[PDB]
């Protein structure tokens, strides 16, 4: 299958209470594998998945250097954004950066990403061709013109199609035993009377990886969205995910309803009915 690597970095200014906090986390697919937190004790990039631990001391030295330098750069970008938006030194602001790359089953480059958001809104993003920028407002167009003049897109493309995919391919190899897995959902259905006239059927999906999944209710084989509830997919805390979907049905009509489960770990989609 295809795979993704992403780093998610957050800078939060806090006037009066020190320099901005900077935290960065790295993921392959839905599995976190590194972190750096400027407020934590170690001041190093730290492992958060077993398969990254076999990286040598030079890895941790170089990754720490990059993420510490980037924290300083985004401290400066927080100051620049204040100037561009005519904001005071009093308030707290957020600067988020995401970047990474996708590879196919043969390990070849598919896509790259590099984008920034300021106070929760898009600021600037590298477009899909890795050759031009989307600027979200007039302030970001200053940055876009600057980055065009300095050919930053070409620098980004060199990383995203090179060292980015080199890393993703390496991590997939070192983390072979766990990152290639598809844990299918373990499914079951519960039944709860809620009145003399209605009952809730709840269809559970537990223990699955990756997180992508679909749960849908049908009645008499037709899609049913009214009188349903569906929670957002949530981490179990052990590297797998959970979801459920519920429907409120007339008492005695339970057998008209089916829950449909699609997940890559499943040989075929499931059609589940209340048992009894």
């Amino acid at each position: 299958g295809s795979h993704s690597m992403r780093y998610f970095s957050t800078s939060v200014s806090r006037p009066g209470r020190g320099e901005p906090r900077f935290i960065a986390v790295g993921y392959v697919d839905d599995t976190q594998f590194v972190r750096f937190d400027s407020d934590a004790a170690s001041q190093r990039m730290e492992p958060r998945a077993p398969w990254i631990e076999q990286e040598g001391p030079e890895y941790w030295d170089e990754e720490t250097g990059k993420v510490k330098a980037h924290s300083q750069t985004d401290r400066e970008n927080l100051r620049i954004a204040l100037r561009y938006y005519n904001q005071s030194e009093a308030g707290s602001h957020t600067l988020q950066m995401m970047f990474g790359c996708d590879v196919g089953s043969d390990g070849r480059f598919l896509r790259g990403y590099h984008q920034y958001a300021y106070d929760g809104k898009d600021y600037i993003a590298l477009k899909e061709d890795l050759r031009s920028w989307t600027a979200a407002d007039m302030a970001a167009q200053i940055t876009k013109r600057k980055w065009e003049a300095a050919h930053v897109a070409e620098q980004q493309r060199a990383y995203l199609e090179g060292t980015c995919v080199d890393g993703l391919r390496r991590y997939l190899e070192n983390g072979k035993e766990t990152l290639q897995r598809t844990d299918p959902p373990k499914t079951h259905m519960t039944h709860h009377p809620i009145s003399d006239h209605e009952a809730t059927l709840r269809c559970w999906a537990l223990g699955f990886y990756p997180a992508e999944i679909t749960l849908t209710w049908q009645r008499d084989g037709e899609d049913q969205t009214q009188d349903t509830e569906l929670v957002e997919t949530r981490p179990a805390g052990d590297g797998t995910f959970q979801k459920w979907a519920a429907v409120v049905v007339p008492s005695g009509e339970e057998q008209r309803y089916t829950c449909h489960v699609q997940h890559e770990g499943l040989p075929k989609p499931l059609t589940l009915r209340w048992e009894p």
């Binding site: 970008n77 300095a150 990383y159 060292t163």
Partner: peptide, 9 residues
Amino acid sequence: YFSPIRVTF
């Protein structure tokens, strides 16, 4: 591998 690119706004 973290990005090596550090540029200002």
